[PDB]
Design a protein around this ligand. Structure first.
Ligand code: ATP
Ligand code: MG
Ligand code: ZN
Lengths: 358, 649
DNA sequence: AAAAAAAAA
């Protein structure tokens, strides 16, 4: 079947250390409980994780001979796994809402309450946690000064060019740099797909993380599991959970192109609350997870080992400049006061446009 | 069975016999270790062996490699990997990076004998044999990584599993095919999650190499072959480069022997798994005594005239043209400013003259003696296809831009013949390049600016059959003034009839035709020759073998050979960046003011852009004498050359 | 998508 190999990584201690960091961390009290409290009150919509905090917490707790390993190295080596570890840790440690909630607007929770009052009354299904989840999880690459604080080479960042990315960087967290050219529209993406069962007990759920999807034919309802059919299952649009999806491509800067070459491109997927944070025609510093994509979508039955690759966005620094539509601020008010004191202006403005031309 | 072990131990014995490879491997290891955790380059795990020593050690293994490498290379690679593993010493390794298992693939160099072929000579009986082919790079594919070995983990078991995938092109030996099906369930049904960051992916690119059209049968089109290379050296060279590729020539695919065939006449597919690539360049590194000699020649008083006279010794006269070519091949520096944007740095030269005055021959000489140049004809070109093209890749199924003629010549020189006969439309495509040295392609959904900082040299005929000295210079030239103003230097040549010059040129031309190649008799024509005896190639200062340059004695002034001149150009274009000073500034401004207000007839009008030409000519002359500062002598010689090119002596 | 031949303006 499949031969087995031994690796020094074990997720039990990693999860325990993650929970201890999330609970005990002091930067108001702990910060990571303040974010969870705001999420519980349906105020915050996404959670951002700073690796600098993890690094410095581990470094400062190393002074006592209890810590044995490091987490940021495993974060850099692999990222997707730690996403579900973090979401599980958050779901386990979600505090109660300290604020009132307009409970009538959450139609999803109302429908789920109706289903529960149906099933549990009889004395029920354990729904997947991601359906109950409302927040989004994002990572933030560390800063170079934090690495300089210590001896270790916890660097990352380093905004490589498009062509500098090789086949050994799949699965790692890398930062790129380039000009955004094409930006698509915003369209919903499915996360959990629900079917109704034609008033036959529980309504079957399904979740698909693939880029393709197949529907069900029969259902596990007891009267439907009875030896004759009782109603055809139908997909329900209201009960399902969706997510915003967007895609874009980035091109290399003309300064980084080697002589006698043609610049290459790179595809970027973005989902969640970060959608529409970038516009075509700007220089950006994008950090994300470099993931492979199957070729089977093209359905050519060729390239048995060749695969397509894409980057999933995690944090975007818009950079470039801001026009600001001359929004009034104090500093520019003293600037225009200085201009008022300057006297006649237009002659100096004419002198100051193109001094290179005589 | 056991033959693998026998070959492995024999190769280990051979590796232990020669101590150079061990030194190289341990040097690579120590460099890699130093790169790890000390306040971006990494050495690939590849070593090149010289099979001459292998032949001198064991002829059986040498013959087995050169005849059937499929049964000999893998044992050698296994033995090399085992040696590297044994010698390696890392007490605290990493987790994901330790499972790379790089097998230390090999490269070869040395005499091949009858296995150095050309793309036309490859035939049936050369299959499954190591070969080395010369050629020119035609086109390349896109770099796409491919999977090798996947890593899986199950939460319940806690045991990491791995599955290995190989294809026909992955390994030299055919094995049972394996699809790309991801294992997602265990034997007991446990869920398996694919672990990125622990799996293995290797880069992949396909290129096509073409036989050189110069050495082709009469009335036959050139033929080409395709080369697959992966992992390292994945993106070396570019289209339009002369290369020598060493690898295994093998077939692949069923090729219709299955039930998919439709007709009788079904042929197989042939392909070369490239092992190594070398730049031919028809070598590029200076020695210590070479630098000594270059300095000794540059400290002389009259190096520039000697170098100018050294260019194309078979062309009579045109000395100022030779000097202009010399200054153009090593022109001034480019300037960039935070507010001034960009300033042009090099020189372009245009020549016009009546027929049969040796312009095309000088153009061919400049092609031959330049570091990089591309030949172009006005009639046989299209402007849209001159810059970029849209082609759909057969593999990926997408359309990608293909580099045009001028883009390939970036940081080079382009020569165009029959320029005045070239279509007016495409002329604008040239003017764009002369504007900002950048071409913009906005077509079919691609918006990209491509850098092209080349210099252009062209020669054109006047509108009439012969030049009329009594007419307006604008009247004699068909090109519009808009592009004519771009060229820094304009030269007009005429074959004035004079019996003294006629006798001199007749004697010179007759002298040239009475020539015989060394060591070959005069009764039979020139015959083609084979390649170099060595497939891959590689007491000081007391000999001056080719340093002084004077091969044959004909005049008191010296001469230099083509290779020494090219080495001088290579040294000058890199090691010196001169800075102008005010002493030359005074002369430049004085002569510009004088020339502008002389108020007499002239070949062409002058404007503010000529002072830029003077500045970059002074920079080029400072580069010629290898100085970091610009002296007034360079200003004087530049002014004299400009006056000659515009007034006439 | 890009090169090459034909009749009408
Ligand atoms: N000064 C010269 N020294 C040697 N050969 C010369 C000289 N002038 C002309 N020739 C000869 O004249 C012949 C014409 O060559 P070529 O066609 O290249 O000249 P051209 O001036 O560029 O002409 P065209 O306008 O037809 O392109 C060549 O064989 C060349 O050797
Ligand atoms: Mg000619
Ligand atoms: Zn039912």
């Amino acid at each position: 079947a499949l031969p087995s190999i031994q690796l020094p990584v074990d997720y039990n201690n990693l999860f325990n250390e993650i929970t201890d960091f999330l609970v005990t961390f002091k930067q108001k009290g702990p910060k990571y409980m303040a974010m969870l409290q705001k999420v519980a009150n349906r105020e915050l919509n996404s959670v951002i994780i700073d690796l600098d905090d993890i690094l410095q917490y581990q470094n400062e707790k190393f002074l006592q001979g209890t810590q044995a390993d490091d987490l940021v190295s495993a974060i850099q080596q692999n990222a997707n796994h730690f996403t579900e570890l973090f979401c599980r840790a958050i779901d386990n440690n979600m505090p109660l809402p300290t604020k009132e909630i307009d409970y009538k607007d959450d139609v999803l929770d109302v429908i789920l309450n109706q289903r529960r009052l149906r099933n549990e009354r009889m004395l029920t299904e354990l729904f997947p946690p991601n359906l109950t989840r409302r927040y989004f999880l994002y990572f933030k690459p560390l800063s170079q000064n934090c690495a300089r604080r210590y001896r270790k080479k916890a660097i990352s960042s380093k905004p490589l060019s498009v062509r500098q990315i090789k086949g050994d960087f799949l699965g790692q967290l890398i930062t790129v740099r380039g000009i955004i050219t094409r930006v698509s529209d915003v369209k919903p993406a499915v996360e959990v797909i629900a079917y109704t069962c034609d008033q036959c007990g529980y309504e079957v759920f399904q979740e698909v993380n693939s880029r393709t999807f197949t529907p069900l034919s029969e259902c596990t309802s007891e009267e439907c599991s009875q030896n004759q059919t009782k109603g055809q299952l139908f997909m329900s649009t209201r009960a399902s959970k969706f997510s915003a999806f967007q895609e874009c491509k980035i091109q290399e800067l003309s300064q980084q192109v080697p002589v006698g070459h043609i610049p290459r491109s790179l595809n970027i997927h973005v989902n969640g609350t970060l959608v529409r944070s970038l516009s075509p025609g700007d220089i950006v510093d994008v950090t994300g997870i470099f993931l492979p994509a199957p070729y089977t979508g093209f359905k050519a039955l060729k390239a048995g080992l060749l695969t397509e690759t894409y980057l999933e966005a995690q944090f975007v620094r818009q950079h470039k400049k801001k026009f600001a539509s001359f929004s009034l601020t104090s500093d520019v008010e003293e600037r225009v006061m200085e201009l008022i004191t300057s006297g006649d202006v237009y002659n100096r403005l004419a002198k100051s446009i193109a001094p290179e031309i005589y | 069975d056991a033959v693998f072990g026998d070959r492995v131990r024999r190769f280990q014995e051979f590796l232990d016999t020669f101590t150079s490879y061990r030194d190289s491997v341990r040097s690579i290891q120590v460099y890699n270790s130093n790169n790890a955790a000390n306040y971006l380059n990494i050495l690939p795990h590849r070593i090149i062996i010289s099979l001459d020593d292998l032949r001198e050690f064991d002829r059986s293994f040498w013959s087995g490699i050169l005849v059937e490498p499929a049964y000999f290379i893998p044992p050698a690679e296994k033995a090399l990997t085992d040696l590297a593993d044994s010698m390696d010493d890392v007490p605290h390794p990493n987790a994901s990076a330790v499972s790379s298992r790089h097998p230390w693939k090999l490269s070869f160099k040395g005499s091949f004998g009858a296995h150095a072929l050309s793309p036309r000579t490859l035939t049936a009986q050369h299959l499954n044999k190591l070969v080395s082919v010369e050629g020119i790079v035609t086109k390349t594919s896109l770099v796409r990584p491919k999977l090798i070995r996947s890593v899986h983990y199950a939460a319940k078991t806690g045991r990491f599993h791995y599955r290995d995938y190989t294809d026909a092109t992955t390994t030299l030996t055919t094995r049972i095919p394996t699809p790309a099906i991801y294992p997602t369930e265990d034997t007991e049904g446990n869920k398996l999650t694919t672990e990125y960051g622990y799996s293995t992916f290797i880069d992949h690119q396909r290129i096509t190499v073409q036989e050189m059209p110069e050495m082709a049968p009469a009335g036959q089109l050139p033929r080409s072959i395709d080369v697959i290379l992966d992992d390292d050296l994945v993106d070396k060279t570019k289209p339009g480069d002369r290369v020598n590729v060493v690898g295994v020539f093998k077939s692949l695919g069923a090729g219709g022997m299955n039930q998919s065939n439709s007709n009788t006449l079904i042929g197989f597919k042939t392909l070369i798994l490239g092992n190594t690539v070398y730049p031919l360049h028809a070598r590029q590194m200076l020695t210590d005594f070479d630098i000594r000699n270059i300095n000794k020649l540059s400290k002389k008083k009259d190096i520039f005239d000697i170098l100018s006279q050294s260019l194309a010794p078979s062309i009579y006269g045109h000395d100022h043209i030779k000097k202009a070519i010399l200054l153009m091949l090593m022109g001034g520096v480019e300037k960039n400013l935070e507010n001034g944007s960009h300033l042009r740095g090099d020189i372009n030269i245009l020549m016009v003259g009546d027929p049969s005055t040796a312009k095309s021959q000088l153009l061919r000489f400049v092609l031959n003696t330049a570091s990089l140049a591309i030949a172009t004809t006005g009639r046989g070109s299209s402007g849209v296809g001159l810059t970029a093209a849209v082609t759909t890749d057969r593999e990926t199924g997408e359309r990608r831009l293909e580099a045009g003629a001028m883009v390939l010549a970036d940081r080079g020189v382009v020569c165009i013949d029959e320029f005045d006969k070239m279509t007016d439309v495409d002329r604008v495509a040239i003017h764009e390049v002369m504007e900002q040295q950048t071409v913009t392609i906005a077509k079919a959904g691609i918006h990209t600016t491509l850098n092209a900082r080349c210099s252009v040299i062209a020669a054109a005929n006047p509108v009439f059959g012969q030049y009329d000295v009594n007419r307006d210079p604008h009247q004699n030239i068909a090109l519009p003034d808009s592009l004519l103003s771009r060229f820094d230097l304009l030269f007009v040549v005429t074959d004035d009839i004079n019996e003294i010059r006629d006798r001199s040129i007749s004697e010179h031309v007759l002298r040239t035709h009475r020539y015989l190649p060394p060591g070959y008799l005069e009764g039979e024509p020139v015959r083609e020759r084979l390649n170099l005896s060595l497939a891959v190639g590689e007491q000081a200062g007391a000999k001056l073998a080719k340093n002084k340059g004077n091969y044959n004695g004909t005049e008191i002034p010296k001469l230099v050979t083509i290779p020494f001149l090219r080495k001088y150009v290579q040294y000058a274009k890199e090691r010196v960046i001169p800075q102008l000073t005010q002493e030359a500034i005074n002369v430049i401004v004085k002569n510009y003011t004088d020339l502008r207000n002389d108020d007499n007839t002239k070949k062409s009008p002058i404007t503010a852009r000529t002072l830029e030409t003077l500045i970059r000519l002074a920079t080029a002359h400072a580069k010629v004498r290898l100085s970091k500062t610009v002296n007034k002598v360079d200003a004087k010689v530049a002014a004299n050359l400009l006056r000659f090119a515009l007034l006439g002596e």
